[PDB]
Amino acid sequence: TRFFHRKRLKWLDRTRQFDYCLARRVFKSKYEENCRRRKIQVLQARGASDAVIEEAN
Amino acid sequence: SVASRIHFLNSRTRFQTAVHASDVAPPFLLLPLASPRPLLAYHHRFRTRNRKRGSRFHPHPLPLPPPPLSPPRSDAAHLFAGKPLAASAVSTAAGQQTLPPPLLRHLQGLFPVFRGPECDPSCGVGPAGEAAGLALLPPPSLVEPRHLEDLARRALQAGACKSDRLFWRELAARVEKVRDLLPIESLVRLLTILTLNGASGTVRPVKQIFQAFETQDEDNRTGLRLASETLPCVRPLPPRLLLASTREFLEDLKKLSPPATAALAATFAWSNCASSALLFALMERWAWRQHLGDFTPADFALFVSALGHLLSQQEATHVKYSRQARHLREISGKQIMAAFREQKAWHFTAAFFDGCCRFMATRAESFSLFSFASAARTLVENLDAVAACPTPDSVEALAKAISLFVASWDGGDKTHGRLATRAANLLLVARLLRAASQCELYIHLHRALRLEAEVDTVGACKTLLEHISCELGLLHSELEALPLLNSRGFVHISPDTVYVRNELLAAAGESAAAVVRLHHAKSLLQLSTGARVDRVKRWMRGQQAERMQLETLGELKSEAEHLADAIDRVLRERGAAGLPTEQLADLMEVFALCVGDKRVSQTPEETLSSLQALSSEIVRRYAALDVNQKRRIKWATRQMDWKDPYLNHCLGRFTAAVTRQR
Amino acid sequence: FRLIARGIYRTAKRFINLPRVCVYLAKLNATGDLQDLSRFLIPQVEAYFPFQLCLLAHAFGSVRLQDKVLFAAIDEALRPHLSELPAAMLVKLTQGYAGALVHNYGLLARVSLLLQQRLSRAATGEADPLTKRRHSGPLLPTLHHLLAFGRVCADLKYQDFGYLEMLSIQMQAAFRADLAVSSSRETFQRFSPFSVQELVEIFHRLKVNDVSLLLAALRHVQARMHDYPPSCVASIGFCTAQMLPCDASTVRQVHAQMLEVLQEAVPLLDLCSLGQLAAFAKKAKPRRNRSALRSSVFEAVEARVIELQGDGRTVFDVGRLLELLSLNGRRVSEEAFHILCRQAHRHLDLFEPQDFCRLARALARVKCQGSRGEQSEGLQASSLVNALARRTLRQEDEFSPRDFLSLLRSLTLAGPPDRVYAVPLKEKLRRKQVLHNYFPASQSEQLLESDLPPSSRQTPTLRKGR
Amino acid sequence: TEPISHMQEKPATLRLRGLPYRTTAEDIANFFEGYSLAGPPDEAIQLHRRMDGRPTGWASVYFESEQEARRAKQDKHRSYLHGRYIEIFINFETGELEWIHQPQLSENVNRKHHGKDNRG
Amino acid sequence: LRHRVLPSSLPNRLFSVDNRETTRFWPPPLQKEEDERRGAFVESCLQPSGKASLLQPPQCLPRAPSHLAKLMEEEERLRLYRHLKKEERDAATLNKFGIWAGEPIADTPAAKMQPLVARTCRQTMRHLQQIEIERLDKQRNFQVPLFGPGDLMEVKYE
RNA sequence: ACAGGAUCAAAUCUUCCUUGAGCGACUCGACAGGCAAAAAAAAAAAAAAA
RNA sequence: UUUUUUUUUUUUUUUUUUUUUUUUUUUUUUUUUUUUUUUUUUUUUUUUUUUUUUUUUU
């Protein structure tokens, strides 16, 4: 899957179809959102109040 | 076959006649019988030599989003440009990265590139650009057999959004692979869903009888919508699917409910695919019991229609292959020498037809106009006039049914809605009329022919002519006008209006055919019977005979005159360019019948005018008409004393089967 | 060039813009390589651009290379993009199929309706959404495009009455608008003298009698007579004569004037035009003196044939010409006949089964006249006869039995061929007869070594020499 | 209602082992009587089998909530079933990165001067 | 006057399982099996008499004489077509390359599409001894009497 | 590859020329297989489906 | 080029509207053995090396 993906990436790149900055932004946003949701759910698991949750994050 | 293609290429007279773009249909295909295929199983062994060395979850290739029309930017600075991009463009630019609804919603509040029409924040974007519902479903390939029906039904509820093709293609493939695991009843529903997806929003041919669903108003002056992408010429279902699925039904035919059988026949019909094995098996199962009675009026019609539609073509094809079979056979020289020395419509089971007839008769009142018409027109196909063969009793039953239906018909209850729907209803009424006409002729001919050796139909028939005369007159005035052949810089011609115009003209031609046939039907009545029969045969074959008279109609003379006036009015203001090719001679014949003992109708009929326009069409289409039609016309024209320099040029210098003989 | 070819083949898979090479190859006539490229072309059909696809199809079609595998793929691929391509690209895509003789009525139907809708939109006064910034062509079609497509249809044998209807109307309106011009500066703006020719050709090929249109065309021709080249007129007349009734007072007047110009303008005509001229002259139905017309025509064409002896590029109905020249007991000049015979050899590749018969009958009628000059047995073409015979024997599965019989008869009467070509025909005739139960009332061996060609060396004969 | 498989968030679930060959969905549904499940038996109960259709003895059971899951666990632990007692295990993490905390590896081991054992 | 097209020969040159034109009859021996099986199925399915065969799962096929006769025609046609096509290709191949695919001449595992194994070797070896014994037994003019250890016997040999 | 080209033009079945030697021959283009389990004198023996 | 005379009735028309056979855009389908045991799979490498572009011939 990695090899076929890389070949398709190269084809896309040569075709002027692939956007490096867009892919990087999507990647970073997804990773940061997953990290944020982990902490939010961990805090909610303890039964803290809405004010405590808002002040923590 | 090489010699057969060369003959078609070298042929100077064979062409592809098409009055309208929508008239063309996919070619007919006859599927073979299933058999064990050990070789295919051995070949399958070579396709799985390295599966152990590959992905265990996604071994198959990855779908590719469709490409754009114009080339992308030089530097591919889509994010810096800030312009909105389509779902496929975003997919292809973000590395085919999934954009769940939360991520898409977060990104839309930060950049305008994601603020596109297809970028729904509440649905998300799929890997392959999927959106608007399809993005919320998993790959078809990954769905278990047990969850296929629900997935397809949910998806059905969902140059824009070009990514659905991938999903449907995947689904199609999946179905095929999992054919042998799904319920027999669920298979039919899956096929129907696929056909609905493949033929959503289409228009049926003008000359076609069978139709899946009934046209209704949709929430343009005419209200009709056309699209070359969804042209009827396009096959909904690949033959592969059908071929694969064929075997399944043979094994569990007894487990199919009548509603499922009707849907199966309709799907087959829609696909244009046929199977002898299946056809016969379905034919030999259902029968009348003193069970066809279980079928409802709506399903019965469809089941009949499909069967007939298929069978006709089946027979036709059989006939064609019969003759080609001759050359494949080898002949020895001794046989050659010996030869040298020496030279010195019935496509229905009787039982089935009887049952159908009885069914119709018994529940005439339970049928609707569309269903009734569809059913009737199908069954009338077998009844011919050359003279197993159906019985007088059987035909009488259908006649009675027709009569009953006519008597119980309300005569329009939708308050005259959309023009296309009204035209379709008029055509259905004409079909009904046609059927009615044919039944009487068959009965009469049979009786008259059999007698030599050793039901009040007209009363019900009379109303259809009046209704058609009124509706055609109303719709002619209500429809918009268009240019005539006979008489920015460009003539405005909307393709959407010629469709309804052709529908109206086809209904008129149908009625003209029916009224013509009625004459013969009546005339057959007791000159000797044999002589009478001979006369009718002459008339039908297009031979020298006695002049045709209208008085024989009797009670129907006034209705015939009104119909002639209606067609004259229509043709005087709408030309003759939308008339059917298969019913051209009838329109000529009806005017010859009207020309008799006349007082004032001589001047309106010339002898632009309707006659002239008809002639103009005849001349135009002379390259398409059959020898029967040509002879009929040749005689008809003579009868009326119609002199045309153009028509006479073609009637004696452009055919060999008529001009080169006497 | 083999070097380059081989290299290209070798490095095929590394070509990003693979289609770009196909167009070059087709222009250079590199069929072999073009065929080979198909291997690698097929898999990447879904990757290329819609405009690339059309160019590929046109390149394939230009060379007369049938590739159903490729074509099918292309068609499949271009499904969702056919509603957004420009007129020129659609034209080229259809041409591609046309070239290869791929009877795609499904595609034809689609394109037909698209053109109609586009035209409607145009008529409505709607601007063009689609349109060195001019990279892509306009979306809306034109009369040239329409004609182009019509020709395609004609080629492919697709009788589209609905399309023709529209076409006729538009043409009629264009004619009418052009006849109202006040100055020569604004004449032949939307169309040229060559477009009516195309139209006529289309209509003739399709075997559709459109009087309303034909007459209209004729009228405009009559009007602007002086602006039409002789060649154009020739063709037009030839086409019209075989469709319209020559006895009509309407067309007669036109024909009469056409012929007069043609006779004067004959010297600038080629073989193709001379044939048409001859045909037209024959088919003409003048009211005035008629005997001299034909004579004059013939006497001129005969002369020009001689001057045109050195022509080896043009394609014409040699058979028809020769037949025409030998009607009503007319005797053909020896020089002319030899020239014609000479010229009639390169065309055999294009010769149809009817052409065969035509030629055969013309030669038989030429020889049946009798002796002429030193030739005691009359004019004969043995070299031609033998080639005809051999080609006929090779193409046994393309003649109807009725035609075959006649052909054989003709051949027999016109310088019977060699034994080797005479023998097998007998067998084939019998076979055909048996098969088809063909036994006309009018109707009422084994090859040996010695009969074979000497040059073939098929016999156990030792000859002297080197 | 969409299937659990296609859901974007799996509910509380357990794991069962040591099941006999003669096991079906209905057996587990009856086993788990008087408890609220995530759905009908066909969706809540999912048997484990290899490519050859051979059961591995493993099973997964869904629950409406973690409280119900734990209550069923504690009330059905070591419960006889077809002559064998079933072992119930938790099939969901808490979310904290507890795996980071690892024991202190031994620095002084003498196999030659210690009793034999099969400990890993 | 008409221009002749150039059909593509690439399908006839491409050799792979994906291409059907070059793999419709890939296995010489197994190609016959198909035919045989087809003939048996048609014979035992298309001509019912009352006895039920046990060759394949039951199917809801027609039983009317007219329908069966109709079907038979199709069957025949397909048979003929396949025969003709195979003949054609064989001829073409032979003409071009001269490649010939004849019938087996001997009974070998290769014929049966099986590998060579010691087991098979042993089997064959045993068979050879069997046959040799059988053959040798015939030549003798006397029957070997029953004897055992401790029994006085008198042998006579040349 | 009968792929290209010439000629008053070839038996069925190309008269003659070009392709440097049609890439040494055939074939493939999702082609090819290092390591692990198991087996294992060289060698051979497993279709895919947790 | 009217009157009139002669020839020809799908067999030979003063000539291909001309006689024959389109599967056409689709020749498309998973065999055998097998009461019961075991590894059936776990991982990686590999093809675009161009200046896509001199943007698709109004």
Helix (H) or strand (E) holding D78: none
**What's C372's DSSP letter?**
B
- Give the C-alpha distances (Å, rounded to integers) separating B250 from B226, B264, B279, E34, E61: 38, 12, 10, 21, 7
Q: Give the residue from B489, B392, B374 showing the smallest Cα distance to B439.
A: B392
Q: How many residues make up chain B in this entry?
A: 662
Strand pairing report for D84-90 and E6-7: unpaired
- Give the C-alpha distances (Å, rounded to integers) separating B556 from B461, B535, B551, E42: 9, 22, 9, 57
Q: Give the residue from B219, B143, B214 showing the smallest Cα distance to B181.
A: B143
Residues of D (46-105) whose Cβ lies below 8 Å from A: 94-96
Phi, psi of D97 (to 5 degrees): -85, 70
**What's C287's DSSP letter?**
S
What residues contact C143, with CB distance under 8 A and at least 6 apart? C170, C171, C174, C190, C191, C195
- Say if residue B512 is exposed, middle or buried (CB neighbours under 10 Å; 0-12, 13-18, 19+): buried
CA dihedral of E131, E134, E140, E145, whole degrees rounded to 10: 130
Phi, psi of C160 (to 5 degrees): -105, 80
Residue type, D21: Y
CA–C1' span, B202 to G11, in Å? 54
Nearest protein residue to nucleotide F1, judged by CA and C1' positions:
C32
Q: Subunits that touch chain B (at least 3 Cβ pairs < 8 angstroms)?
A: A, C, D, E
Partner B contacted by D50 (CB < 8 A): no
Helix (H) or strand (E) holding D49: strand D45-49
- Give the C-alpha distances (Å, rounded to integers) separating E60 from B248, B293, B294, E155: 11, 21, 20, 75
Tokens of E76: 């025949």
**What's B27's DSSP letter?**
P
Span between the terminal Cα atoms of chain C, in Å? 36
Helix, strand, or coil here: C201? Answer: helix
**Among E2, E3, E8, beta carbon nearest to C66:** E8
Tokens of B657: 């089967």
Q: What is the 3-state secondary structure (H, E, C) of B227-252?
A: CCCCCCCCCCCCHHHHHHHHHHHHHC
Would you call B37 and E2 a contact, using CB atoms and an 8 Å cutoff?
no
What residues contact B406, with CB distance under 8 A and at least 6 apart? B432, B436, B460, B461, B463, B464
What residues contact B639, with CB distance under 8 A and at least 6 apart? B547, B548, B592, B595
Upper half-sphere CA count for residue C9 (Cβ side, 13 Å): 12
- Say if residue C98 is exposed, middle or buried (CB neighbours under 10 Å; 0-12, 13-18, 19+): buried
Strand pairing report for C158-160 and D79-81: unpaired
Would you say the C-beta of B51 is within 7 Å of strand F? Answer: yes
Please give residues of chain C from 383 to 442 whose alpha-adjacent beta carbon (CB) lies under 7 Å from any atom of strand F.
383-384, 386-387, 390, 393-394, 420-421, 424
Question: What is the spatial distance between Cα C18 and Cα C8, in angstroms, rounded to a whole number?
Answer: 10
Residue type, B169: R
Question: What is the spatial distance between Cα D34 and Cα D72, in angstroms, rounded to a whole number?
Answer: 9
Question: What is the spatial distance between Cα C177 and Cα C180, in angstroms, rounded to a whole number?
Answer: 6
- Say if residue B85 is exposed, middle or buried (CB neighbours under 10 Å; 0-12, 13-18, 19+): buried
Question: What is the spatial distance between Cα B129 and Cα B123, in angstroms, rounded to a whole number?
Answer: 12
Q: Give the residue from B524, B510, B371 showing the smallest Cα distance to B441.
A: B524
Q: Give the residue from B119, B124, B147 showing the smallest Cα distance to B134.
A: B124
What residues contact B307, with CB distance under 8 A and at least 6 apart? B265, B279, B282, B283, B378
Tell me which method was used to determine the 3D structure. Answer: cryo-EM
Q: Give the residue from C6, C11, C55 showing the smallest Cα distance to C32.
A: C6
Partner B contacted by C89 (CB < 8 A): no
Tokens of D3: 């299937």
Would you say the C-beta of B49 is within 7 Å of strand G? Answer: no
Strand pairing report for C65-66 and E6-7: parallel
Alpha helices in B109-183 (DSSP H): 148-156, 164-177
Tokens of D72: 């069923």
Cβ atoms of B231 and C110 closer than 8 Å: yes
**What's C190's DSSP letter?**
S
Q: Give me the residue label for tokens 């078609």.
A: B8
Q: Give the residue from E29, E31, E26 showing the smallest Cα distance to E112.
A: E29
Tokens of B106: 């977060």
Question: What is the spatial distance between Cα C407 and Cα C409, in angstroms, rounded to a whole number?
Answer: 5
Residues of C (359-418) whose Cβ lies below 8 Å from B: 397-398
Tokens of B318: 């059989």
Cβ–Cβ contacts within 10 Å for residue B212, how many?
A: 18
Helices and strands in chain A: count of H runs, count of E runs: 3, 0
Span between the terminal Cα atoms of chain A, in Å? 37
Cβ atoms of B544 and B464 closer than 8 Å: no
Question: What is the spatial distance between Cα B508 and Cα B591, in angstroms, rounded to a whole number?
Answer: 13
Question: What is the spatial distance between Cα B471 and Cα B484, in angstroms, rounded to a whole number?
Answer: 23
Question: What is the spatial distance between Cα B215 and Cα B197, in angstroms, rounded to a whole number?
Answer: 17
Question: What is the spatial distance between Cα C3 and Cα C37, in angstroms, rounded to a whole number?
Answer: 16
Helix (H) or strand (E) holding B160: none
Helix (H) or strand (E) holding D76: helix D66-76
Per CB-CB distance under 8 Å, the chain B contacts of A16 are: 71-74, 76
Cβ atoms of B124 and B99 closer than 8 Å: yes
Question: What is the spatial distance between Cα C6 and Cα C33, in angstroms, rounded to a whole number?
Answer: 9
Cβ atoms of B201 and B225 closer than 8 Å: yes
Upper half-sphere CA count for residue B580 (Cβ side, 13 Å): 23
Task: Please report how the helices C382-394 and C401-413 are oriented relative to each other, as an axis angle in degrees rounded to 10.
Answer: 160
CA–C1' span, B45 to G35, in Å? 28
Cβ–Cβ contacts within 10 Å for residue B40, how many?
A: 9
CA–C1' span, C249 to F10, in Å? 54
CA–C1' span, E58 to F4, in Å? 61
- Give the C-alpha distances (Å, rounded to integers) separating B337 from B344, C435, E103: 11, 12, 36
Question: What is the spatial distance between Cα B232 and Cα E96, in angstroms, rounded to a whole number?
Answer: 46
Q: Give me the residue label for tokens 């055999």.
A: C348
Using the CA of C66, give the nucleotide whose C1' is nearest: G25
Task: Please report how the helices E28-45 and B38-45 are oriented relative to each other, as an axis angle in degrees rounded to 10.
Answer: 140
Helix, strand, or coil here: B463? Answer: helix
What residues contact B309, with CB distance under 8 A and at least 6 apart? B209, B210, B269, B378
Cβ atoms of C364 and C378 closer than 8 Å: no
Tokens of B75: 């530097």
Question: What is the spatial distance between Cα C59 and Cα C422, in angstroms, rounded to a whole number?
Answer: 44
**What's C462's DSSP letter?**
-
Check residue D34 and give left, alpha or beta (phi > 0: left; psi -120 to 50: alpha): left
* C-alpha of C331 from chain center: 29
Vertex C201 angle, CA C200 and C207, to 5°:
90
Q: Give me the residue label for tokens 């697709």.
A: C158
Would you call E8 and C69 a contact, using CB atoms and an 8 Å cutoff?
yes
Per CB-CB distance under 8 Å, the chain E contacts of C36 are: 10
What residues contact B83, with CB distance under 8 A and at least 6 apart? B112, B113
Span between the terminal Cα atoms of chain D, in Å? 47
Question: What is the spatial distance between Cα E92 and Cα C294, in angstroms, rounded to a whole number?
Answer: 54
Q: Give the residue from C223, C252, C225 showing the smallest Cα distance to C240.
A: C252
Q: Give the residue from E32, E76, E71, E78 showing the smallest Cα distance to E48.
A: E71
Residue type, C14: R
Please give residues of chain C from 433 to 452 whose alpha-adjacent beta carbon (CB) lies under 7 Å from any atom of strand F.
447, 452
Tokens of B101: 């609804």
Helix, strand, or coil here: D81? Answer: strand
Helix, strand, or coil here: A29? Answer: helix
Question: What is the spatial distance between Cα A35 and Cα A30, in angstroms, rounded to a whole number?
Answer: 9
Do E and D touch, counting CB pairs below 8 Å (3 needed)? no
Per CB-CB distance under 8 Å, the chain E contacts of B33 are: 71, 74-75
Q: Give the residue from B559, B357, B525, B317 showing the smallest Cα distance to B441.
A: B525
What residues contact B207, with CB distance under 8 A and at least 6 apart? B23, B506, B580, B582
Resolution stated for this PDB structure, in Å: 2.9
Question: What is the spatial distance between Cα C3 and Cα A52, in angstroms, rounded to a whole number?
Answer: 78
Upper half-sphere CA count for residue B415 (Cβ side, 13 Å): 1
**Among B16, B491, B620, beta carbon nearest to C170:** B491
Nearest protein residue to nucleotide G23, judged by CA and C1' positions:
B1
Helix, strand, or coil here: D86? Answer: strand
**Chain G nucleotides reached by a protein CB under 7 Å:** 1-2, 9-31, 40-50, 52-53, 55-58
CA–C1' span, E32 to F48, in Å? 26
Residue type, B601: S
* C-alpha of E118 from chain center: 25
Q: What is the 3-state secondary structure (H, E, C) of B467-535?
A: HHHHHHHHHHHHCCCCCCCCCCCCCCCCHHHHHHHHHHHHHHHHHHHHHHHHHHHHHCCCCCHHHHHHH
Instruction: Give B318-352 as a DSSP string.
Output: HHHHHHHHHHHS---HHHHHHHHHH-----S-HHH
CA–C1' span, D47 to G37, in Å? 24
Phi, psi of C375 (to 5 degrees): -65, 105
Q: Give the residue from C207, C189, C194, C146 showing the smallest Cα distance to C171.
A: C146
Per CB-CB distance under 8 Å, the chain D contacts of A38 are: 95
Strand pairing report for B29-30 and B273-274: parallel
Q: Give the residue from C279, C328, C275, C327 showing the smallest Cα distance to C302.
A: C275
User: Which long-range contacts does E122-128 make (Cβ < 8 Å, 24+ apart)?
Assistant: none
- Give the C-alpha distances (Å, rounded to integers) separating C366 from C283, C308, C317, C338, C360: 22, 22, 17, 12, 10
Helix (H) or strand (E) holding C361: helix C353-368
Nearest protein residue to nucleotide F27, judged by CA and C1' positions:
E15
Q: Subunits that touch chain D (at least 3 Cβ pairs < 8 angstroms)?
A: A, B
Cβ–Cβ contacts within 10 Å for residue C136, how many?
A: 15
**Among E2, E3, E6, beta carbon nearest to C65:** E6
Residues B388-418 as b/e (b if ≥16 CB within 10 A, e otherwise) read eebeeebbbbbbbbbbbbbeebeeeeeeeeb
CA–C1' span, D114 to F22, in Å? 80
Question: What is the spatial distance between Cα B525 and Cα B535, in angstroms, rounded to a whole number?
Answer: 12
Partner C contacted by B239 (CB < 8 A): no
| Most distant pair of Cα atoms in chain A: their distance | 53
**Among B76, B95, B103, beta carbon nearest to A16:** B76
Question: What is the spatial distance between Cα B633 and Cα B618, in angstroms, rounded to a whole number?
Answer: 9
Q: Give the residue from C112, C109, C52, C108 showing the smallest Cα distance to C81.
A: C52
Would you call A33 and B103 a contact, using CB atoms and an 8 Å cutoff?
yes
